[PDB]
Amino acid sequence: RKCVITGKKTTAGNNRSHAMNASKRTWGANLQKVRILVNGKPKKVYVSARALKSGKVE
Template sequence: MAKCDICGKGISTGIKLSHSHIRTKRTWSPNVQKVRALVNGAPKKINVCTRCLRSGKVQRAI
C-alpha cells in the first residue's frame, strides 16, 4: 500500500535483532502522503513520499 507514485519507493523488509539475539522479521514503511498534484496539467490525487515533495519533483495543485 505504501508506495510512491513518483520514485517507486515501497516497503523494505529486514530483521529486528534483540539484545538476546532473537531475530524477527520487520518492515520499514516510507512516509507516503496523499497529495493533490498536477499530472499532465490536471490536478489529481497521488501518493508521494516526502523526499519527492521536498526535492521539488512534484508540483502541488492549489
C-alpha cells in the same frame, strides 16, 4: 502503498533485539496523500516526503 514519482515502497527487514534475536518485520516509506499534478490534469495521489523535498508542483 506505492509512490508515483519514485519506486519507494515497503521493504522487509529483520528486527534484532538485545541478544541479537531475529524477528522479521517491515519498513514503510513516508508516503503522504497529497493533491498534485500527474499529467497537466491535477489529482490526489501518494508521494514521499523525500520526493516532495525536491520542490514538486501542488
